[PDB]
Amino acid sequence: ADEPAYLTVGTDVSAKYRGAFCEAKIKTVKRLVKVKVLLKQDNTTQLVQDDQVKGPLRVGAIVETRTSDGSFQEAIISKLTDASWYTVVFDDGDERTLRRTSLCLKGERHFAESETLD
């Protein structure tokens, strides 16, 4: 898991702050997906990661997910929202979990201003 699972660990990146760039260094890589599940019984929808969701990651698939009750109920995927936690260490020595969207990798200006979700 502490491997190039999406991107790579140890890599220096820039993270967006309020439309500006800050440098950071990838401490941990977490490849997770935010599965929008909807419980078949309680009809409640939630958006939780594939660690909470036991089963295939397919929209319209039947899985079991951890409800806020701590129980695992059989649910259906209604969406999978991409996610990744790059725990990046900023020059301050602080490391915070940033979703890939905040990571600019090198820092070329197609972030901060530009971003078409591509």
mmCIF file with all atom_site columns, C-alpha atoms in Angstrom:
data_model
loop_
_atom_site.group_PDB
_atom_site.id
_atom_site.type_symbol
_atom_site.label_atom_id
_atom_site.label_alt_id
_atom_site.label_comp_id
_atom_site.label_asym_id
_atom_site.label_entity_id
_atom_site.label_seq_id
_atom_site.pdbx_PDB_ins_code
_atom_site.Cartn_x
_atom_site.Cartn_y
_atom_site.Cartn_z
_atom_site.occupancy
_atom_site.B_iso_or_equiv
_atom_site.pdbx_formal_charge
_atom_site.auth_seq_id
_atom_site.auth_comp_id
_atom_site.auth_asym_id
_atom_site.auth_atom_id
_atom_site.pdbx_PDB_model_num
ATOM 1   C CA . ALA A 1 1   ? 0.000   0.000  0.000   1.00 0.00 ? 1   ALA A CA 1
ATOM 2   C CA . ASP A 1 2   ? 2.968   2.343  0.810   1.00 0.00 ? 2   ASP A CA 1
ATOM 3   C CA . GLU A 1 3   ? 3.911   1.897  -2.817  1.00 0.00 ? 3   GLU A CA 1
ATOM 4   C CA . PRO A 1 4   ? 3.120   3.582  -6.166  1.00 0.00 ? 4   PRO A CA 1
ATOM 5   C CA . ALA A 1 5   ? -0.532  2.661  -5.927  1.00 0.00 ? 5   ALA A CA 1
ATOM 6   C CA . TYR A 1 6   ? -1.750  5.640  -7.869  1.00 0.00 ? 6   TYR A CA 1
ATOM 7   C CA . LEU A 1 7   ? 1.168   7.967  -7.756  1.00 0.00 ? 7   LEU A CA 1
ATOM 8   C CA . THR A 1 8   ? 4.441   7.464  -5.995  1.00 0.00 ? 8   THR A CA 1
ATOM 9   C CA . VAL A 1 9   ? 5.777   7.924  -2.480  1.00 0.00 ? 9   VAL A CA 1
ATOM 10  C CA . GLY A 1 10  ? 8.799   10.106 -1.686  1.00 0.00 ? 10  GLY A CA 1
ATOM 11  C CA . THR A 1 11  ? 7.989   12.359 -4.552  1.00 0.00 ? 11  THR A CA 1
ATOM 12  C CA . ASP A 1 12  ? 8.074   16.087 -4.102  1.00 0.00 ? 12  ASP A CA 1
ATOM 13  C CA . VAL A 1 13  ? 4.935   17.813 -5.127  1.00 0.00 ? 13  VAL A CA 1
ATOM 14  C CA . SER A 1 14  ? 3.132   21.031 -4.792  1.00 0.00 ? 14  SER A CA 1
ATOM 15  C CA . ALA A 1 15  ? -0.214  21.306 -3.088  1.00 0.00 ? 15  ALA A CA 1
ATOM 16  C CA . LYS A 1 16  ? -2.706  24.043 -3.712  1.00 0.00 ? 16  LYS A CA 1
ATOM 17  C CA . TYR A 1 17  ? -3.560  26.470 -0.942  1.00 0.00 ? 17  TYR A CA 1
ATOM 18  C CA . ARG A 1 18  ? -6.170  29.127 -1.727  1.00 0.00 ? 18  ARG A CA 1
ATOM 19  C CA . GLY A 1 19  ? -5.048  29.262 -5.362  1.00 0.00 ? 19  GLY A CA 1
ATOM 20  C CA . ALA A 1 20  ? -1.364  29.324 -4.532  1.00 0.00 ? 20  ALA A CA 1
ATOM 21  C CA . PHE A 1 21  ? 1.244   26.602 -4.527  1.00 0.00 ? 21  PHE A CA 1
ATOM 22  C CA . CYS A 1 22  ? 2.962   25.173 -1.476  1.00 0.00 ? 22  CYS A CA 1
ATOM 23  C CA . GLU A 1 23  ? 5.597   22.494 -1.728  1.00 0.00 ? 23  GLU A CA 1
ATOM 24  C CA . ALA A 1 24  ? 5.162   19.171 -0.076  1.00 0.00 ? 24  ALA A CA 1
ATOM 25  C CA . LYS A 1 25  ? 6.766   15.780 -0.058  1.00 0.00 ? 25  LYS A CA 1
ATOM 26  C CA . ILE A 1 26  ? 4.700   12.568 -0.304  1.00 0.00 ? 26  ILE A CA 1
ATOM 27  C CA . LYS A 1 27  ? 5.021   10.666 2.969   1.00 0.00 ? 27  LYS A CA 1
ATOM 28  C CA . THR A 1 28  ? 2.269   8.136  2.402   1.00 0.00 ? 28  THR A CA 1
ATOM 29  C CA . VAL A 1 29  ? 0.230   6.987  -0.594  1.00 0.00 ? 29  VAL A CA 1
ATOM 30  C CA . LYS A 1 30  ? -3.274  5.742  -0.126  1.00 0.00 ? 30  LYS A CA 1
ATOM 31  C CA . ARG A 1 31  ? -5.264  4.562  -2.990  1.00 0.00 ? 31  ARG A CA 1
ATOM 32  C CA . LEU A 1 32  ? -8.887  4.558  -1.995  1.00 0.00 ? 32  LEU A CA 1
ATOM 33  C CA . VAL A 1 33  ? -12.162 5.095  -3.646  1.00 0.00 ? 33  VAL A CA 1
ATOM 34  C CA . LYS A 1 34  ? -15.131 6.832  -2.161  1.00 0.00 ? 34  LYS A CA 1
ATOM 35  C CA . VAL A 1 35  ? -17.919 4.518  -2.847  1.00 0.00 ? 35  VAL A CA 1
ATOM 36  C CA . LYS A 1 36  ? -21.371 5.983  -2.798  1.00 0.00 ? 36  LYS A CA 1
ATOM 37  C CA . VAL A 1 37  ? -23.379 3.214  -1.421  1.00 0.00 ? 37  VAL A CA 1
ATOM 38  C CA . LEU A 1 38  ? -26.946 2.991  -0.635  1.00 0.00 ? 38  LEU A CA 1
ATOM 39  C CA . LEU A 1 39  ? -28.120 0.501  1.905   1.00 0.00 ? 39  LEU A CA 1
ATOM 40  C CA . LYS A 1 40  ? -30.832 -1.780 0.499   1.00 0.00 ? 40  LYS A CA 1
ATOM 41  C CA . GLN A 1 41  ? -32.647 -2.148 3.791   1.00 0.00 ? 41  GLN A CA 1
ATOM 42  C CA . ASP A 1 42  ? -32.448 1.291  5.377   1.00 0.00 ? 42  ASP A CA 1
ATOM 43  C CA . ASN A 1 43  ? -32.233 3.038  1.979   1.00 0.00 ? 43  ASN A CA 1
ATOM 44  C CA . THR A 1 44  ? -29.619 5.327  3.385   1.00 0.00 ? 44  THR A CA 1
ATOM 45  C CA . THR A 1 45  ? -26.902 6.568  1.171   1.00 0.00 ? 45  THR A CA 1
ATOM 46  C CA . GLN A 1 46  ? -23.358 7.189  2.237   1.00 0.00 ? 46  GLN A CA 1
ATOM 47  C CA . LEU A 1 47  ? -20.014 7.845  0.659   1.00 0.00 ? 47  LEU A CA 1
ATOM 48  C CA . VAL A 1 48  ? -17.198 5.858  2.177   1.00 0.00 ? 48  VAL A CA 1
ATOM 49  C CA . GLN A 1 49  ? -13.950 4.359  1.099   1.00 0.00 ? 49  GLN A CA 1
ATOM 50  C CA . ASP A 1 50  ? -13.313 0.805  -0.232  1.00 0.00 ? 50  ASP A CA 1
ATOM 51  C CA . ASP A 1 51  ? -11.860 -0.129 3.168   1.00 0.00 ? 51  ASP A CA 1
ATOM 52  C CA . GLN A 1 52  ? -15.349 0.306  4.630   1.00 0.00 ? 52  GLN A CA 1
ATOM 53  C CA . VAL A 1 53  ? -16.851 -1.427 1.634   1.00 0.00 ? 53  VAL A CA 1
ATOM 54  C CA . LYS A 1 54  ? -16.410 -5.111 1.276   1.00 0.00 ? 54  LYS A CA 1
ATOM 55  C CA . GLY A 1 55  ? -17.166 -6.230 -2.214  1.00 0.00 ? 55  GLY A CA 1
ATOM 56  C CA . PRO A 1 56  ? -16.740 -5.360 -5.945  1.00 0.00 ? 56  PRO A CA 1
ATOM 57  C CA . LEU A 1 57  ? -16.309 -1.766 -6.871  1.00 0.00 ? 57  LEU A CA 1
ATOM 58  C CA . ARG A 1 58  ? -18.861 -1.522 -9.581  1.00 0.00 ? 58  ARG A CA 1
ATOM 59  C CA . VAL A 1 59  ? -21.661 0.900  -9.915  1.00 0.00 ? 59  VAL A CA 1
ATOM 60  C CA . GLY A 1 60  ? -24.753 -1.118 -9.388  1.00 0.00 ? 60  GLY A CA 1
ATOM 61  C CA . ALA A 1 61  ? -22.976 -3.915 -7.527  1.00 0.00 ? 61  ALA A CA 1
ATOM 62  C CA . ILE A 1 62  ? -24.063 -5.473 -4.284  1.00 0.00 ? 62  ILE A CA 1
ATOM 63  C CA . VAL A 1 63  ? -21.585 -5.081 -1.442  1.00 0.00 ? 63  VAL A CA 1
ATOM 64  C CA . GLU A 1 64  ? -21.469 -4.700 2.291   1.00 0.00 ? 64  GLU A CA 1
ATOM 65  C CA . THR A 1 65  ? -20.446 -1.502 3.854   1.00 0.00 ? 65  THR A CA 1
ATOM 66  C CA . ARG A 1 66  ? -19.970 -0.097 7.284   1.00 0.00 ? 66  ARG A CA 1
ATOM 67  C CA . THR A 1 67  ? -22.857 2.061  8.286   1.00 0.00 ? 67  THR A CA 1
ATOM 68  C CA . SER A 1 68  ? -22.383 4.787  10.955  1.00 0.00 ? 68  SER A CA 1
ATOM 69  C CA . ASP A 1 69  ? -23.883 2.275  13.374  1.00 0.00 ? 69  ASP A CA 1
ATOM 70  C CA . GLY A 1 70  ? -20.727 0.187  13.079  1.00 0.00 ? 70  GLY A CA 1
ATOM 71  C CA . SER A 1 71  ? -22.678 -2.594 11.482  1.00 0.00 ? 71  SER A CA 1
ATOM 72  C CA . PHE A 1 72  ? -22.152 -3.922 7.966   1.00 0.00 ? 72  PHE A CA 1
ATOM 73  C CA . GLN A 1 73  ? -25.222 -3.852 5.818   1.00 0.00 ? 73  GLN A CA 1
ATOM 74  C CA . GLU A 1 74  ? -25.668 -5.077 2.294   1.00 0.00 ? 74  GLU A CA 1
ATOM 75  C CA . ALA A 1 75  ? -25.675 -2.079 0.030   1.00 0.00 ? 75  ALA A CA 1
ATOM 76  C CA . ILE A 1 76  ? -25.393 -1.089 -3.608  1.00 0.00 ? 76  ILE A CA 1
ATOM 77  C CA . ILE A 1 77  ? -22.787 1.147  -5.251  1.00 0.00 ? 77  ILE A CA 1
ATOM 78  C CA . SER A 1 78  ? -24.427 4.149  -6.803  1.00 0.00 ? 78  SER A CA 1
ATOM 79  C CA . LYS A 1 79  ? -21.138 6.023  -7.600  1.00 0.00 ? 79  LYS A CA 1
ATOM 80  C CA . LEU A 1 80  ? -17.440 5.670  -7.053  1.00 0.00 ? 80  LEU A CA 1
ATOM 81  C CA . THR A 1 81  ? -15.723 8.941  -6.497  1.00 0.00 ? 81  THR A CA 1
ATOM 82  C CA . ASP A 1 82  ? -11.981 8.744  -7.013  1.00 0.00 ? 82  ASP A CA 1
ATOM 83  C CA . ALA A 1 83  ? -9.870  9.541  -4.003  1.00 0.00 ? 83  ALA A CA 1
ATOM 84  C CA . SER A 1 84  ? -6.330  9.176  -2.796  1.00 0.00 ? 84  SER A CA 1
ATOM 85  C CA . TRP A 1 85  ? -4.660  10.311 0.348   1.00 0.00 ? 85  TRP A CA 1
ATOM 86  C CA . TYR A 1 86  ? -1.276  11.639 -0.153  1.00 0.00 ? 86  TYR A CA 1
ATOM 87  C CA . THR A 1 87  ? -0.009  12.425 3.182   1.00 0.00 ? 87  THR A CA 1
ATOM 88  C CA . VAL A 1 88  ? 2.387   15.069 2.205   1.00 0.00 ? 88  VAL A CA 1
ATOM 89  C CA . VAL A 1 89  ? 4.939   16.765 4.342   1.00 0.00 ? 89  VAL A CA 1
ATOM 90  C CA . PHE A 1 90  ? 5.182   20.412 3.848   1.00 0.00 ? 90  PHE A CA 1
ATOM 91  C CA . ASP A 1 91  ? 8.393   22.380 4.409   1.00 0.00 ? 91  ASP A CA 1
ATOM 92  C CA . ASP A 1 92  ? 6.997   23.278 7.847   1.00 0.00 ? 92  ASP A CA 1
ATOM 93  C CA . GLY A 1 93  ? 7.441   19.619 8.835   1.00 0.00 ? 93  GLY A CA 1
ATOM 94  C CA . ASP A 1 94  ? 3.730   19.064 8.960   1.00 0.00 ? 94  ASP A CA 1
ATOM 95  C CA . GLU A 1 95  ? 2.139   16.317 7.018   1.00 0.00 ? 95  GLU A CA 1
ATOM 96  C CA . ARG A 1 96  ? -1.480  16.437 5.985   1.00 0.00 ? 96  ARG A CA 1
ATOM 97  C CA . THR A 1 97  ? -3.603  14.122 3.872   1.00 0.00 ? 97  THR A CA 1
ATOM 98  C CA . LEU A 1 98  ? -4.234  15.684 0.515   1.00 0.00 ? 98  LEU A CA 1
ATOM 99  C CA . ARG A 1 99  ? -6.512  14.333 -2.115  1.00 0.00 ? 99  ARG A CA 1
ATOM 100 C CA . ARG A 1 100 ? -4.736  14.039 -5.555  1.00 0.00 ? 100 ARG A CA 1
ATOM 101 C CA . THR A 1 101 ? -6.753  17.120 -6.787  1.00 0.00 ? 101 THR A CA 1
ATOM 102 C CA . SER A 1 102 ? -4.668  19.343 -4.512  1.00 0.00 ? 102 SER A CA 1
ATOM 103 C CA . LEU A 1 103 ? -1.418  17.848 -5.806  1.00 0.00 ? 103 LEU A CA 1
ATOM 104 C CA . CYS A 1 104 ? 0.201   19.615 -8.631  1.00 0.00 ? 104 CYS A CA 1
ATOM 105 C CA . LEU A 1 105 ? 3.112   17.157 -8.891  1.00 0.00 ? 105 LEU A CA 1
ATOM 106 C CA . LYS A 1 106 ? 5.718   19.419 -10.369 1.00 0.00 ? 106 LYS A CA 1
ATOM 107 C CA . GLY A 1 107 ? 3.760   22.592 -10.122 1.00 0.00 ? 107 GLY A CA 1
ATOM 108 C CA . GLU A 1 108 ? 3.220   23.471 -13.739 1.00 0.00 ? 108 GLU A CA 1
ATOM 109 C CA . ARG A 1 109 ? 0.417   25.993 -14.028 1.00 0.00 ? 109 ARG A CA 1
ATOM 110 C CA . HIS A 1 110 ? -2.484  23.809 -14.952 1.00 0.00 ? 110 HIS A CA 1
ATOM 111 C CA . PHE A 1 111 ? -3.485  23.908 -11.327 1.00 0.00 ? 111 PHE A CA 1
ATOM 112 C CA . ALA A 1 112 ? -4.354  26.842 -8.986  1.00 0.00 ? 112 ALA A CA 1
ATOM 113 C CA . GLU A 1 113 ? -5.918  28.703 -11.866 1.00 0.00 ? 113 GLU A CA 1
ATOM 114 C CA . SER A 1 114 ? -6.712  25.997 -14.350 1.00 0.00 ? 114 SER A CA 1
ATOM 115 C CA . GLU A 1 115 ? -8.532  22.759 -13.485 1.00 0.00 ? 115 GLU A CA 1
ATOM 116 C CA . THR A 1 116 ? -11.138 21.137 -15.627 1.00 0.00 ? 116 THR A CA 1
ATOM 117 C CA . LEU A 1 117 ? -11.166 17.960 -13.454 1.00 0.00 ? 117 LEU A CA 1
ATOM 118 C CA . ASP A 1 118 ? -8.847  16.407 -15.971 1.00 0.00 ? 118 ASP A CA 1
#
